[PDB]
Design a binder for this molecule. Sequence first.
Ligand SMILES: [Zn+2]
Lengths: 587, 587, 587
Amino acid sequence: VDVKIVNTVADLESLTANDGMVAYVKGYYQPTNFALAKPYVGGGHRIYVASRAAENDGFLCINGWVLQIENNTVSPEHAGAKLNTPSFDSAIPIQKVLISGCKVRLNGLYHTSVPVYYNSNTTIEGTGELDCGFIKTTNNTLSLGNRTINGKIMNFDVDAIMVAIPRVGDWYAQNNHLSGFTLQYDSALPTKGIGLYAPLIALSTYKSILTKNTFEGIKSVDAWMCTWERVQASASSRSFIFGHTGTAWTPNNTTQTFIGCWATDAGLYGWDLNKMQGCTMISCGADFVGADGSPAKALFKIVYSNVTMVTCMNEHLHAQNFLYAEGSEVNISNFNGQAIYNKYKPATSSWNNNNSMFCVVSNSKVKLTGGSFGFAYNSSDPTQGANCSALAYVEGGSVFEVSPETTFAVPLEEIGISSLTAFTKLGVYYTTNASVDAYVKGVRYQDGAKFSGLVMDSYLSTSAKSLGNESITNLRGSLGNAVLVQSSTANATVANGFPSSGVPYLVQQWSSAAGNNSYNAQLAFAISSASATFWLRTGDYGQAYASWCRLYHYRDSLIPAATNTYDLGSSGSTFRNAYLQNAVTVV
Amino acid sequence: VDVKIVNTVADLESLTANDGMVAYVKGYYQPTNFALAKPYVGGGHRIYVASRAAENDGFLCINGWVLQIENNTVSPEHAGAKLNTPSFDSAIPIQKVLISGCKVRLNGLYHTSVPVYYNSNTTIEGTGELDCGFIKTTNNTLSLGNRTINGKIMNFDVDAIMVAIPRVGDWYAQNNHLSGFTLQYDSALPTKGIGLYAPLIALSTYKSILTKNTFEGIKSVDAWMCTWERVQASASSRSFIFGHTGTAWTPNNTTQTFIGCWATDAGLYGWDLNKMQGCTMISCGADFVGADGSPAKALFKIVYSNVTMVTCMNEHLHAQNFLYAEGSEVNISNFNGQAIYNKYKPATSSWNNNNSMFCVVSNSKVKLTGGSFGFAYNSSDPTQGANCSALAYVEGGSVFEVSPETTFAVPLEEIGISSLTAFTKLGVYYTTNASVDAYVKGVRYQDGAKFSGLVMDSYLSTSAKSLGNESITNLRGSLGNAVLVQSSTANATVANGFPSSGVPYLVQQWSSAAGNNSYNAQLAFAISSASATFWLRTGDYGQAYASWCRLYHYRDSLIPAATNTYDLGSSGSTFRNAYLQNAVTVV
Amino acid sequence: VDVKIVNTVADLESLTANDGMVAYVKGYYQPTNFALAKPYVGGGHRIYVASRAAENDGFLCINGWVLQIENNTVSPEHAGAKLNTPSFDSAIPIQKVLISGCKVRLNGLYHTSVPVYYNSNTTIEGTGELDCGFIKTTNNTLSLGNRTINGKIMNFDVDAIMVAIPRVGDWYAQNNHLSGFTLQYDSALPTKGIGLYAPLIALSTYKSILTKNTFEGIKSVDAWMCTWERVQASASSRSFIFGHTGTAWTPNNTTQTFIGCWATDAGLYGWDLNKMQGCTMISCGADFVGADGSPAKALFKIVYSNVTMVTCMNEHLHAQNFLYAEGSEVNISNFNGQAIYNKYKPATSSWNNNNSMFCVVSNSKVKLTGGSFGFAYNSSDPTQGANCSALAYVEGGSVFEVSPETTFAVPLEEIGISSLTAFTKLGVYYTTNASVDAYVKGVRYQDGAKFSGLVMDSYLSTSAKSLGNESITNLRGSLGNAVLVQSSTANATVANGFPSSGVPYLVQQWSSAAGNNSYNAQLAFAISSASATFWLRTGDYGQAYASWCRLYHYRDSLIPAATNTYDLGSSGSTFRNAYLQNAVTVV
Ligand SMILES: [Zn+2]
């Protein structure tokens, strides 16, 4: 007995067959374009199972004829999809193969009028993102209704292209391995939806997946142990959303890795991350987030998360914040950020809504380890200087660290404590309940409870601060304990607080602490070519400096500061003897 | 002339055939469940090769009928395995396809009574870890015996599920690419073995592989240039073992990458790493290592290795050490460790067996770059305070570094040199041959040979240390060179070491070094509202401070410390002239 | 009607068939070795399309017989390639399948006389790099000629094995996914070429690809959003080249990730990187770069790039530089470099051509975050010490940072400002227009415009520098503001600059800044067991120290430094009264 030829699966119904007969189906449908290189698709061998003659699911069993699957791999064509045929709705055939338990190969573009879903242990593989994937032509949803999962009412009937749904009885859509295809809406649709709605996912790999022409690219609530490699989310509003708060399920995430992923076009947030724990981004990028005159809120919104960004990038950013960090630890190492137009302000500012590139709030920790940040504007810009952002606002127990090798397209301007939430210079502003360790203009500034002291069993060598035309009387606010040098005899003047003009000085200043009020002392060395005079003075807290006091020593006469004022000894504390070469001169 | 149908491969034996005849085999076996969606498996086209009529290997050539392989891909079914049939031993068919040179697709669960091995250039692909893989039902081994490899006697006859074995004449099982399946023992076995025994491996990728119900998960001796992505090792003893010392082969490893890998359930070590050079872990996790009252020895045991952990995690840890590092460099960046019950102690302690979270020994280097560590207990805990661990023990030339932004669930308690190996506070303890650079309670402590000095061509501005009700005579052990402020007049007393009571002070203390004994000097500014007194004293090494000395200066009388004791001049060193307003008063 | 058997595709031409007939072709060619396990390859089902009877492309349509492709996957055999047949040129069949739009499976070694190219959306999968891939047997090129792409005339007619070419109308060969094969020249060819010439590529993944027996391994001009996993480039001149400057296209690159990649054998550069932005290397290696007596120029040449290396390695390096960095930011974290023979020098040195391990020029930023660097030689080495390199040369606005936990095989020797470009010690040399923050022999050295000051609202406790038999008069070049201790009475001598010999000292030195010339002052405490003498002196800029001055205080007599020289008071500023126990002694 020999293998019988059948033109299409539709021809199987009428065929006369004995149990166990084998047929070769040329294609699922008759080709409509015989000029194609690949006209016959979706066919293959079938074996007749007489006991199932009444069954017809349009795919694995058609009138008893069971599809012979090679190495457990099928394509949507085998269930009746059509390739690169925009007028044909492939939704039903795609859905059948996605839940078949087979590996699914995507071999062109398939058009769909409803979302398609996958569950667990599903491998889907196309050959690349230009030519393989799903094009959704409507805003229609699934029609599955509510399900209760771990006591939470969940619903998957959203306007999306693809949806991840746990198996019945499970909590996560897990052990899935998707690669090499695109998810897009028909660009003509006036309203777009979600690319991939994957609320509850785990233990999965996503590679070389492109979603574009979406409102929201990739959207999840609770994801754990997933890797994302070369995933691009192009969206009009938010590209990547993790920890979505809009369901009954409590957001939480762990161990998400993103390698070579790409956020583009988002007008609200590039990345919207909530409860993202153990998250690493490696050589990721973000292009064209926000637009001129229509800023995004932030490139990265990172809330109750801990994230490391390793050699990541952005190009062309119009946003109020570069990073909004709330309750989050973010280590940004060797970033390269370009064309960031930091000219946007909120209508009404507040602790968590302000014009800073790094908005670091509510016990966050943000560190810039090297990197280059192309923030276009500081207050001296001739076109946007009046609109420039701060570099950072740090509040509510947070800490912000900037390495000495981090670079910026234009100079930083200042750093200091601030009670404001609206800024006018490219500076680092922090509250009294915050900590900073930041280089600004080559000077490292450390302040706050995390930086209370430095105790080292080590020797220390430092340089003096070289003074310009400035008063050493008026350094109580700007310097604490510090060594000063005045090497210009023109600037070493009595008007500038020195005991005598016209000679260089080294000055040790002591302080309780630089501040609005302080205790101070100074030791001044008036350094001449082969001699010096030595001077001490003190400043009480809230008082002007007291008069300078010239020290008496054995290589100088003892000349009092005023005549007929000071004594040698007292009646109760005499000097024992006095040895003079000449008799006392009584004036 | 036409393709002939054959029901099963067993039917090929009796088929009279001409050379070059083509047959289509419906399936390897007759189906036993025609309700399956996929009842016929393991069949395919065969061509008769008359000159091989006597051959039957049950797979590629059956009584001369040669299997026609599509794109060099086969399944164990093609050699006679059965899917999801626990009573059927698929060991032999699996082994045949694994050494066939074909890509191997795994399409369900296959049960095995012996280990299965792979060599080199082997690609094995399942669709996911829930439904694809090998279930081993015995503790049986391979039966290959000893082989000599590079002069070393090696033996692969261990109780494992899968074994990597070099090709004959080669040193490594290399250029393998495994993905998307599980290796498990039957949970009913009283004793379990190794999931993957891969002693000598190289130049390979492992992705989306789960081992569970094992004693040891993944075990290797010499691995180089391998990547591991989404590999989970669930084991009762040790999850991941690299550089295993128990063979004739010298352990050594290079360039192993772990991305999104997961160690679970291990009761001895989560990771046991030996000679692991150039190893990166990215967003890996570890859950349920140890149990309450049954601690693991360490989450990570890292010996003669260098490892970077980037945004890794753990949840639920009962162990004596978090990290044991011996001769190892470990950089832990932005960790997030949760529910670590640091209440375990060894019965006898030693340099390399002690109750510390970070046991940093024998020329190790361990750095915590940020991160959050959920160590539950310090000595204040009401229920486990008497059982808490140290944060760290550092010895034998090692260095331990804790960044200022690293956080802990409960506060660190102290840091200091210790000769003990058993601790009772959540502190940092180090020997005289160790180095530390660690923030404790907002104070950075640097000590040891790696931190001998700081030489900066930079100015320095610092604050004073504000004293409480403290003696400045008794700061020789706790402070070195340091500026002090006493802003409370009530505490500026002679009993507290001040020369002049009841005014605020700035004090410069000098020291050889804080310690049990030291050289010291102090300069004290006794600050009043418009004047001060200036004082010096010294303390010799091993001696009490000498008396305070009030300096003479040109804005004060010269009143000696005691009457009729000190002279103006000497017979051999006179003052030249003396100018007094009044005649000398001879008392 | 049944499926008709056909022996070979050559037998199709003489097949009388009706429209729609189905044939099964045993193999593309008649097998020549029926002892093979897989003798029949490249066949499959075909369907006769009468309207195309005149077409014969040797692949998808042979005299009207259209190939039935399963799940859009083919092998070069289906177009007439031969496996493991060195005398057969498979170039034309390979090329046909690479541009077919199918997934391409590689099932052995194919030999080629010309390069083969791919465009976009191409997936190519072998089972491993030992047995799958392309062997090029000539130095022949493509013959496609000049093409204008985005305004630049490009030419792809180079001697390469595989070439990436954009589709017409596109700028990049993109969305390709290649894995699991090798690209090699016939080792017998006297001259080798490029392995993979991929000038313009984007949005792609490359995995488990080996190039070897090449002159240049992988060569690109403009690559963005590509990942490379387990890619090995073995080349005689340069292993990896990105940003190749030798075309009309302006070099630029972004977001390239390398995980477990390996550069070997290169004699000029291991990695030659130009305009590589956002690049991360993870657990990559480099072996046998340069040769003894024939050094490479550098292991890494990194120009106008920013690169992070995470736990990377090298073994066996003969090169003039380890890293040449020009206008680049490079963070090298936890490196492990072994067997680096730093004994090579240029014939004529210059700012960008010198004998340094880290040549850090033109506004570069290079940081060593931990790591271990096996530089074999410093100047005391008994076989090569006279040839040793510097550790680093830092110039032209660059910054070089060395962490305290970075280790070296042999000790570093010195650090300082240098006007030289040729070195003879393993030191850190930098220009006056450069910055350093580097530990050397346990001491942190910070200098340059990036390290101008440190301002901390924090207290500070430090140790004294313990002096040997050294002069405190000659510490103006080596220390600035510093505390010194001399605990040896034998070394506290007038010859060593002390004012009073034979007692231990604490000394506070002040300075404008350590340098060739400086302002200085010193306060010396000559410490006896229950007393001290207190001394001040100053040194003017460019002058020797002035004489020491012993301070007068109330617990000492006032003995002048010379007799009959100094006065008590002056005619114009008298002391008011004098209280003596005895009458003045007029000497
Ligand atoms: Zn067939």
